[PDB]
Write a protein that holds these residues in place. Structure first.
Motif, PDB file in Angstrom:
ATOM      1  N   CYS B  64       0.822  -1.198   0.000  1.00 36.33           N
ATOM      2  CA  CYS B  64       0.000   0.000   0.000  1.00 36.33           C
ATOM      3  C   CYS B  64       0.869   1.267   0.000  1.00 36.33           C
ATOM      4  CB  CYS B  64      -0.916  -0.019   1.222  1.00 36.33           C
ATOM      5  SG  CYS B  64      -2.029   1.379   1.331  1.00 36.33           S
ATOM      6  N   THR B  65       1.821   1.334   0.932  1.00 35.00           N
ATOM      7  CA  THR B  65       2.732   2.469   1.058  1.00 35.00           C
ATOM      8  C   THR B  65       3.611   2.556  -0.189  1.00 35.00           C
ATOM      9  OG1 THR B  65       2.903   2.419   3.482  1.00 35.00           O
ATOM     10  CG2 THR B  65       4.746   3.370   2.277  1.00 35.00           C
ATOM     11  N   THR B  66       4.078   1.403  -0.633  1.00 34.08           N
ATOM     12  CA  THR B  66       4.923   1.311  -1.806  1.00 34.08           C
ATOM     13  C   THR B  66       4.185   1.769  -3.071  1.00 34.08           C
ATOM     14  OG1 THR B  66       6.696  -0.294  -1.378  1.00 34.08           O
ATOM     15  CG2 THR B  66       5.469  -0.514  -3.448  1.00 34.08           C
ATOM     16  N   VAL B  67       2.925   1.369  -3.205  1.00 38.39           N
ATOM     17  CA  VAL B  67       2.155   1.759  -4.377  1.00 38.39           C
ATOM     18  C   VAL B  67       1.869   3.263  -4.389  1.00 38.39           C
ATOM     19  CG1 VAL B  67      -0.262   1.778  -5.073  1.00 38.39           C
ATOM     20  CG2 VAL B  67       1.074  -0.301  -5.317  1.00 38.39           C
ATOM     21  N   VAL B  99      11.726   3.010  -9.497  1.00 39.14           N
ATOM     22  CA  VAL B  99      10.942   3.319  -8.313  1.00 39.14           C
ATOM     23  C   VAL B  99      11.357   2.611  -7.013  1.00 39.14           C
ATOM     24  CG1 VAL B  99       8.668   3.348  -7.333  1.00 39.14           C
ATOM     25  CG2 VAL B  99       9.011   4.151  -9.622  1.00 39.14           C
ATOM     26  N   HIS B 100      11.613   1.309  -7.041  1.00 36.77           N
ATOM     27  CA  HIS B 100      12.009   0.668  -5.789  1.00 36.77           C
ATOM     28  C   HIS B 100      13.350   1.187  -5.293  1.00 36.77           C
ATOM     29  CE1 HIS B 100       8.829  -2.036  -7.105  1.00 36.77           C
ATOM     30  NE2 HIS B 100       8.630  -2.186  -5.808  1.00 36.77           N
ATOM     31  N   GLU B 101      14.268   1.473  -6.217  1.00 30.80           N
ATOM     32  CA  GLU B 101      15.571   1.987  -5.834  1.00 30.80           C
ATOM     33  C   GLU B 101      15.315   3.307  -5.097  1.00 30.80           C
ATOM     34  OE1 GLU B 101      18.363   2.294  -9.134  1.00 30.80           O
ATOM     35  OE2 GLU B 101      18.238   0.120  -9.421  1.00 30.80           O
ATOM     36  N   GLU B 225      17.711  -8.277  -4.918  1.00 25.55           N
ATOM     37  CA  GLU B 225      17.501  -9.234  -3.839  1.00 25.55           C
ATOM     38  C   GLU B 225      16.022  -9.141  -3.490  1.00 25.55           C
ATOM     39  OE1 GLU B 225      21.701  -9.072  -2.527  1.00 25.55           O
ATOM     40  OE2 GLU B 225      20.720  -9.984  -4.275  1.00 25.55           O
ATOM     41  N   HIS B 226      15.530  -7.913  -3.438  1.00 23.59           N
ATOM     42  CA  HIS B 226      14.133  -7.686  -3.114  1.00 23.59           C
ATOM     43  C   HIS B 226      13.206  -8.395  -4.110  1.00 23.59           C
ATOM     44  CE1 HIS B 226      11.083  -5.664  -0.828  1.00 23.59           C
ATOM     45  NE2 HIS B 226      10.474  -5.329  -1.951  1.00 23.59           N
ATOM     46  N   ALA B 227      13.466  -8.215  -5.404  1.00 26.40           N
ATOM     47  CA  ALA B 227      12.654  -8.838  -6.446  1.00 26.40           C
ATOM     48  C   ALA B 227      12.694 -10.360  -6.381  1.00 26.40           C
ATOM     49  CB  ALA B 227      13.105  -8.365  -7.798  1.00 26.40           C
ATOM     50  N   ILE B 249       5.696  -4.559 -12.441  1.00 25.66           N
ATOM     51  CA  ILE B 249       7.087  -4.168 -12.269  1.00 25.66           C
ATOM     52  C   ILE B 249       8.013  -5.366 -12.115  1.00 25.66           C
ATOM     53  CG2 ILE B 249       8.747  -3.044 -10.747  1.00 25.66           C
ATOM     54  CD1 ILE B 249       6.549  -1.093  -9.960  1.00 25.66           C
ATOM     55  N   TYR B 250       7.619  -6.298 -11.255  1.00 24.19           N
ATOM     56  CA  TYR B 250       8.414  -7.488 -10.998  1.00 24.19           C
ATOM     57  C   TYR B 250       8.419  -8.554 -12.074  1.00 24.19           C
ATOM     58  CZ  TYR B 250       9.234  -5.569  -6.424  1.00 24.19           C
ATOM     59  OH  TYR B 250       9.664  -4.748  -5.416  1.00 24.19           O
ATOM     60  N   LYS B 251       7.305  -8.684 -12.781  1.00 23.12           N
ATOM     61  CA  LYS B 251       7.168  -9.665 -13.848  1.00 23.12           C
ATOM     62  C   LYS B 251       8.424  -9.837 -14.708  1.00 23.12           C
ATOM     63  CE  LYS B 251       4.718  -7.811 -17.000  1.00 23.12           C
ATOM     64  NZ  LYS B 251       3.448  -7.296 -17.597  1.00 23.12           N
TER      65      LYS B 251
HETATM   66  C1  LIG Z   1       8.048   0.905   2.057  1.00 23.56           C
HETATM   67  C2  LIG Z   1       7.033   0.254   3.013  1.00 23.56           C
HETATM   68  C3  LIG Z   1       7.227   0.880   4.402  1.00 23.56           C
HETATM   69  C4  LIG Z   1       6.646   0.031   5.519  1.00 23.56           C
HETATM   70  C5  LIG Z   1       7.467  -0.959   6.095  1.00 23.56           C
HETATM   71  O1  LIG Z   1       8.742  -1.066   5.557  1.00 23.56           O
HETATM   72  C6  LIG Z   1       9.632  -2.167   5.838  1.00 23.56           C
HETATM   73  C7  LIG Z   1      10.889  -2.067   4.945  1.00 23.56           C
HETATM   74  C8  LIG Z   1      10.462  -2.233   3.509  1.00 23.56           C
HETATM   75  O2  LIG Z   1       9.931  -3.548   3.358  1.00 23.56           O
HETATM   76  C9  LIG Z   1       9.131  -3.881   2.219  1.00 23.56           C
HETATM   77  C10 LIG Z   1       8.829  -2.927   1.152  1.00 23.56           C
HETATM   78  C11 LIG Z   1       7.978  -3.340   0.073  1.00 23.56           C
HETATM   79  C12 LIG Z   1       7.474  -4.702   0.071  1.00 23.56           C
HETATM   80  O3  LIG Z   1       6.647  -5.214  -0.923  1.00 23.56           O
HETATM   81  C13 LIG Z   1       6.033  -4.314  -1.925  1.00 23.56           C
HETATM   82  C14 LIG Z   1       6.983  -3.989  -3.114  1.00 23.56           C
HETATM   83  O4  LIG Z   1       7.983  -4.710  -3.310  1.00 23.56           O
HETATM   84  O5  LIG Z   1       6.721  -3.032  -3.842  1.00 23.56           O
HETATM   85  C15 LIG Z   1       7.812  -5.681   1.072  1.00 23.56           C
HETATM   86  C16 LIG Z   1       8.650  -5.270   2.187  1.00 23.56           C
HETATM   87  C17 LIG Z   1       6.995  -1.774   7.148  1.00 23.56           C
HETATM   88  C18 LIG Z   1       5.688  -1.589   7.615  1.00 23.56           C
HETATM   89  C19 LIG Z   1       4.837  -0.597   7.052  1.00 23.56           C
HETATM   90  C20 LIG Z   1       3.457  -0.429   7.601  1.00 23.56           C
HETATM   91  C21 LIG Z   1       2.961  -1.311   8.790  1.00 23.56           C
HETATM   92  O6  LIG Z   1       2.664   0.403   7.193  1.00 23.56           O
HETATM   93  C22 LIG Z   1       5.310   0.230   5.987  1.00 23.56           C
HETATM   94  O7  LIG Z   1       4.591   1.110   5.480  1.00 23.56           O
END
Ligand SMILES: CCCc1c(OCCCOc2ccc(OCC(=O)O)cc2)ccc(C(C)=O)c1O
Ligand SMILES: CCCc1c(OCCCOc2ccc(OCC(=O)O)cc2)ccc(C(C)=O)c1O
Lengths: 254, 254
Positions: B64-67, B99-101, B225-227, B249-251
């Motif tokens: 959600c935050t990432t999107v 974007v992920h970078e 590593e993430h992907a 993105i990951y595909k």
């Molecule tokens: C950037 C996301 C920031 C973040 C967290 O980051 C952890 C480090 C980053 O970890 C990840 C980032 C993205 C992910 O998957 C989505 C993607 O790859 O785009 C998986 C793990 C952990 C918890 C929350 C909450 C509770 O709101 C949160 O918003």
């Protein structure tokens, strides 16, 4: 809806350097390029990229410059449509990818007539005959746009109709690999429903005009398909002639 | 060049709600360290698929935050001088692979040795709690902390970051880039901009620029590593959905 339709109209008026209104006026409703001599004459000044080679290949490159340039204008037009700008850039790209040519050929109708079409922002007029004299490969991929244009011009649409019609073609839920299909089909529907009411107001006595345009949209889909196959035959048989990188990316999977 | 920097700094200040120098204030926030605290934040700290389990639910929060960060970055990139001149398709390529970078870089701004801020700093999720998550999700999170901690050691501010971020997006190495030279040239200016900017803003610091370029490479290895980890989750973690955009993105990453 009537406001949304006006909004789309303004995006069209602001992003396109050539509207049908102008086109029809110029064509009285311009340097005539009809042979190698006149085209050379036009290239020098009266009118107006990869190294030369021959008349038929040089005219194909002009089609490309023109189409790529129109793709830039269709990108700004779509971007000037609030709903379209909401979609993730990837879907925006998918839509443009599969819709610009359909949109380009619909708009080509504006600057076309039984005898030819305008080029270089209305300054030149290239004859259908000349275009017909070109080498079989190129001469046959050009001719069909004319056949479709003449017929399309008989419906007598104006820029206001075209603006809605072009937006509908771009915002289509059918395109390969679309991500947010529902959202897209919703925007189109709104577009179509506004076109529906617009035509009733703008063309009060034209019956069946609306379903006629939906058919024209399906027609444009078949016109592009055949255009693409012909484009594939050119990339296969015309080894020496190049293709703008942006056009290779569109016909990448078409 | 002095303007260019300043112009990219403002584009960064209006496109990103949460800045490092803001995340630094509210950190000198409701502490989320377990299931009950998370529950109350999800009720109180009014920040998704039906509640599955804590590990997955937190995973969905990341997406959600990432999107939403991708949404911001898209708007930011569009503010970058020559970025918008690039054809949409290249813009998509740059965003897709960058974007992920960018995201993992900015993540550092809101990160602690002990956790990070969420929902506009109104919340703070401990690192320990994230480390307590079920087997797979805990391992992909931790590395971002390890990278973030060292990164904060460079003590950069929002003015620096804006250039650093734009430099990550404008990368001419991304697979399938149409106009590579164009992108490489825009990136050079950003770098030289970053170049001089670092001189005035961090005269004392030594080797900061070469340091940052290395950080950009590290970030490139971090996402790879993430992907991979993401690929494994999409495979073995059946029943766990993946936002469609993140799926696009990951595909194509290996
Ligand atoms: C950037 C996301 C920031 C973040 C967290 O980051 C952890 C480090 C980053 O970890 C990840 C980032 C993205 C992910 O998957 C989505 C993607 O790859 O785009 C998986 C793990 C952990 C918890 C929350 C909450 C509770 O709101 C949160 O918003
Ligand atoms: C939209 C192109 C408009 C156009 C012509 O259209 C012919 C009908 C359209 O025919 C084609 C359209 C595109 C095409 O290839 C490029 C592509 O398919 O993207 C090949 C033929 C013919 C000549 C010129 C000149 C002299 O400047 C020109 O600008």
């Amino acid at each position: 809806l009537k406001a949304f339709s006006k909004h789309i109209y303004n995006a069209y008026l602001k992003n396109f350097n050539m509207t049908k209104k102008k086109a029809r006026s110029i064509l009285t409703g311009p340097f005539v390029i009809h042979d190698i001599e006149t085209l050379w004459q036009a290239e020098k000044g009266l009118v107006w990229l990869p190294p030369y080679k021959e008349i038929s290949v040089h005219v194909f490159y002009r089609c490309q410059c023109t189409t790529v340039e129109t793709v830039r204008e269709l990108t700004e037009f779509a971007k000037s449509i609030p709903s379209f700008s909401s979609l993730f850039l990837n879907d925006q790209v998918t839509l443009l990818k599969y819709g610009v040519h359909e949109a380009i050929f619909a708009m080509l109708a504006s600057i076309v007539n039984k005898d030819g079409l305008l080029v270089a922002n209305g300054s030149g007029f290239v004859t259908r005959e000349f275009l017909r004299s070109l080498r079989k490969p190129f001469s046959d991929i050009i001719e069909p746009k004319f056949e479709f244009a003449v017929k399309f011009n008989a419906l007598e649409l104006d820029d206001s109709d075209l603006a809605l019609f072009i937006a509908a073609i771009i915002l289509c839920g059918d395109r390969p690999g679309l991500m947010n299909v529902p959202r897209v089909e919703a925007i189109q529907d709104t577009i179509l429903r506004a076109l529906e009411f617009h035509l009733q107001a703008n063309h009060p006595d034209a019956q069946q005009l609306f379903p006629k345009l939906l058919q024209k949209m399906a027609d444009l889909r078949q016109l592009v398909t055949e255009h693409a196959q012909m484009m594939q035959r050119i990339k296969k048989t015309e080894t020496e002639t190049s293709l703008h990188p942006l056009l290779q990316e569109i016909y990448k999977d078409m």
